[PDB]
Amino acid sequence: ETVPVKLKPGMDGPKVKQWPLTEEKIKALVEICTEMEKEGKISKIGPENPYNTPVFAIKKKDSTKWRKLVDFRELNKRTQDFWGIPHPAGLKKKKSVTVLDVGDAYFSVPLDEDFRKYTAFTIPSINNETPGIRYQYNVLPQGWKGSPAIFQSSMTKILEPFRKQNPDIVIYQYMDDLYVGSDLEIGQHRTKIEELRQHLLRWGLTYELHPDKWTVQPIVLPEKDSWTVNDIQKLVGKLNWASQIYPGIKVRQLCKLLRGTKALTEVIPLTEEAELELAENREILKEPVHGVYYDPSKDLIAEIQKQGQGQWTYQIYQEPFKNLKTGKYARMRGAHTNDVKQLTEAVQKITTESIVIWGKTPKFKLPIQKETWETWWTEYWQATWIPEWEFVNTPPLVKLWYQLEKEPIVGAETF
Amino acid sequence: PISPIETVPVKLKPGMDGPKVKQWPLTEEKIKALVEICTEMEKEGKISKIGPENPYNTPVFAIKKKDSTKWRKLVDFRELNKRTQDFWEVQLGIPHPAGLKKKKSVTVLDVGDAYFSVPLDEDFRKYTAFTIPSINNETPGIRYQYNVLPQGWKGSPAIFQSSMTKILEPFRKQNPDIVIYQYMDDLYVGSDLEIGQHRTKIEELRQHLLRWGLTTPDKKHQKEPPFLWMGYELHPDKWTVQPIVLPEKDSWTVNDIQKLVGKLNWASQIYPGIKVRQLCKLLRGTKALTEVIPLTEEAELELAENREILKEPVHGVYYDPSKDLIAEIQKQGQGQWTYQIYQEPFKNLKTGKYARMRGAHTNDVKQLTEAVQKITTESIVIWGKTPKFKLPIQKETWETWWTEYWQATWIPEWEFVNTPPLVKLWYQLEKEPIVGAETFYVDGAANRETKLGKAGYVTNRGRQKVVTLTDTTNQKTELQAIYLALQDSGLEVNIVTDSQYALGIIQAQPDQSESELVNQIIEQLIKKEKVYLAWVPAH
Ligand SMILES: CCOCn1c(Cc2ccccc2)c(C(C)C)c(=O)[nH]c1=O
């Protein structure tokens, strides 16, 4: 049957325009949609339905098979609330988590007839020689928040038998995904996961994270045989900025070493007073600032800075200077000449951690121009959900500070 | 004789009501024409005599066109329109000549009064009511309502197109090697079939439309190539540009110069060389649109060079999906870029240029990057593919720049082509302090309220200077301090400042700015053999 979904009081459906698509993509969406249309999941619609939601095609790893991805961000936001499952704090303390796309299960359930208009979408045509092909959903759409919700009774129902057979494994559902964490060893783990898929397949359904490894990393300050006017000037500027975080960070003694119009390359002898100050700073930076807790009723935020040479830094927080987590991302093999790829990959990684830790995606602040992002991010997108984002200008010092983060002695040695 | 086509469910905007505007008064003449026209339409099936059961109303008007000087009619739906629901955007992203695939033939069919061929949602009908006045407001005038998509009504175009799509679906399934393009009241049916097989297929399409009610056009009205598509003439073999005529006059108003500057600007996209600098220059301090500004010798001249360029036969090619798509770019002056997309050398599909985007602060590579993205967006829409690029910038200049820029940026598959001027990095701030070189400790401070300030420096070597400024700002002093350091130093310099703006200069390393001052600093930067900018916290 169909449960009466609705929009939040005063809201109207999305009327987001279709961004242009490549011919490869339009051809696949066309294939995919005639099929969905034949199977009864979507129906062509008229011009009386003024709504719209962007669509695109992504690649299902290992296959040539193109997957359809609708961007329901606007509909989701306008969709009434249903007050999902409470986040399992245990999930982060698990040796290895795996992700599975259970979005395919929704086509089975029908969509409230009165809500369908709101799911309208369009397939463009090259050079616009053909009018777009409009359809709306007759079933639960993938990527819509209302789906996992409405399909919850059925999801837990099919899940129990496995959960009891393996009570040491955690299963969490966000959107179309299922993250399964267990403390079992790689093989016993994955074999146990595939055990889950076989289970999941006898109804209709078909990433390897390691959360316990996510180390909180500190800021390590430079140490030197001799310090130059410049070195000190560089150090003083970072420390001064950093005092917005740890107010006990001081640069007065150091600043006195900068009294004088001397050559930038000139070496300055550090006064013991200046040396204690620095040592007291290292001690302060030795640990995360106090009293930072996650407030569930507040937007989570993720800022990123391009560090150069394939390196990237980010910090997830809710309040300025009160970080919940910080980190670095080094490009993945192959991404050598493409920043947008490194960026989308970073956003996906960061977003899954967020899901894994707090069970919600953050709102990003991306160091990219709007048009560069909008034109190419889909090319490298691989997750079923899509986070929110805003485009920003990276303050020179925020980057300078986080580049100071501690890296391994040698590295996580994979013998 | 209307149509067995299913109607579209139409409604009024959020709880509104249909128009109830009063019928404008008309003479016995204008009325008698309208009476004629409405007895006809009443029988074509398009409208229907109604009665006292309808409070709705729209004003009907009588105009005589030129075609027959015959009394015609016009219904003013402005009100009903502002009260009718919103429809999904009718086609507002139209084809571009450069993306058309050439065809052995294209035949344009006229689905002219096809608006009146499509039924109206019987429920909505009451809202389209109007009244034929009586001789100077006598007894009741004649009342009617539409039973088809009304000309000028808001939903007609959308609904007409949709209706046409459903009707056309069968034909398209049955012969995919035939492309039909729906625009307004035309169907541009094209194909690669033998001209005889083509003519035959079109007759079938025509006879198919006949089933659904669309009455077949007259031979007199028929349209033949080349087709006009705003600034272009599509010929079966290729496209050309429509004759763009600059009129010769002895008296130019501001309007004439603005309208002119417009047309010329449009031509800069197609024709190589167009210039409007001296024409625009005539606009300075104008006091009225009707103001007559005399053309200087210089405006006269460029106008003439223009008339000449514009009499060149710029022609073009159509798209062949089996050939490479290539896009070349030229930096035509700082901030201006020209590009031409082709598949086979010298046979362009499209050309164009991007105006000097006068921003607050960038660099050439960033700007080249932006021209490359705009182009890419264009190509995806036009051809659903991105062009291989040929860029006047060395692959080394790109690696050195992009790889270190604070912002994500990219250029798709591209290749270097040496067609000067090559874009490059005007300067690269040093990575570390210059040993040897003099160090300037610069400072500028101004009173934001009195706008009186000072700017100067002191160097490790002893040199110093201070300059007093009036009608300055603190940022200007901070910056002028930097300026003097550059002017007064040798080819290698180390400069220290607490100017937060200089911290931005160090990150982005702009080579063009919105500030003349920052600009001057750039000219000095570029001039040095080595510069090291070191920022330090103020106070
Ligand atoms: C005679 C050349 O006309 C341009 N032409 C056309 C018609 C055409 C005419 C006006 C606007 C758009 C398209 C088509 C289609 C739409 C039939 C084509 O495929 N190729 C082509 O060269």
Characterise this structure:
- The complex is a heterodimer of chains A (415) and B (539).
- With 415 residues, chain A is of the alpha+beta class.
- Chain A folds into four domains: 1-85 and 107-147, HIV Type 1 Reverse Transcriptase, Chain A, domain 1 (Roll); 86-106 and 148-213, Alpha-Beta Plaits (2-Layer Sandwich), CATH 3.30.70; 214-294, 2-Layer Sandwich (Alpha-Beta Plaits), CATH 3.30.70; 295-405, Alpha-Beta Plaits (2-Layer Sandwich), CATH 3.30.70.270.
- In chain A, 30% of the residues lie in helices and 19% in strands.
- Chain A is built from eleven helices and 16 strands.
- Chain A has helices spanning 23-38, 73-78, 146-150, 152-165, 186-201, 229-242, 252-257, 272-284, 339-358, 370-376, 396-402; strands at 42-44, 55-59, 66-70, 96-101, 121-123, 133-137, 170-174, 177-182, 208-209, 227-228, 267-268, 301-308, 311-319, 322-330, 363-366, 388-391.
- In chain A, the strands form five sheets. Chain A has a five-stranded mixed β-sheet with strand order 14-13-12-15-16. Chain A has a four-stranded antiparallel β-sheet with strand order 7-8-4-9.
- In chain A, helix 6 (229-242) packs across helix 11 (396-402).
- Chain A is elongated.
- The termini of chain A are far apart.
- Chain B starts with 27 loop residues before the first helix and ends with a strand.
- In chain B, strand 7 and strand 8 form a beta hairpin.
- By secondary structure, chain B is an alpha+beta fold.
- Chain B is built from twelve helices and 24 strands.
- Chain B has helices spanning 28-44, 78-81, 156-174, 195-211, 254-267, 277-280, 297-309, 364-383, 395-402, 474-488, 500-508, 516-527; strands spanning 47-49, 60-61, 74-75, 105-110, 130-132, 142-146, 178-183, 186-191, 227-228, 232-235, 238-241, 315-316, 326-331, 337-344, 347-354, 361-362, 388-391, 414-416, 438-446, 452-459, 464-470, 492-497, 512-513, 530-535.
- In chain B, the strands form seven sheets. Chain B has a five-stranded mixed β-sheet, covered by helices on one side. A five-stranded mixed β-sheet of chain B has the order 21-20-19-22-24. Chain B has a four-stranded antiparallel β-sheet with strand order 9-10-11-12, with no helix packed on it.
- In chain B, helix 10 runs parallel beside helix 12.
- Chain B is elongated.
- Chain B folds into five domains: 1-90 and 116-156, HIV Type 1 Reverse Transcriptase, subunit A, domain 1 (HIV Type 1 Reverse Transcriptase, Chain A, domain 1); 91-115 and 157-225, Reverse transcriptase/Diguanylate cyclase domain (Alpha-Beta Plaits, 2-Layer Sandwich), CATH 3.30.70.270; 226-319, Alpha-Beta Plaits (2-Layer Sandwich); 320-426, Reverse transcriptase/Diguanylate cyclase domain (Alpha-Beta Plaits, 2-Layer Sandwich), CATH 3.30.70.270; 427-538, Ribonuclease H-like superfamily/Ribonuclease H (Nucleotidyltransferase, domain 5), CATH 3.30.420.10.
- At the A-B interface, helix 1, helix 6, strand 12, helix 9 and helix 10 of A face helix 3, strand 7, helix 8, helix 11 and strand 24 of B.
- The complex binds 6-benzyl-1-ethoxymethyl-5-isopropyl uracil.
- Chain B: The record marks 440-441 as: Cleavage.
- Chain B: Residues 434-539 form the RNase H type-1 domain.
- Chain B: This is Reverse transcriptase/ribonuclease H.
- Chain B: A motif (Tryptophan repeat motif) lies at residues 398-414.
- Chain B: Mg(2+) 2 binds at residues 443, 478, 498.
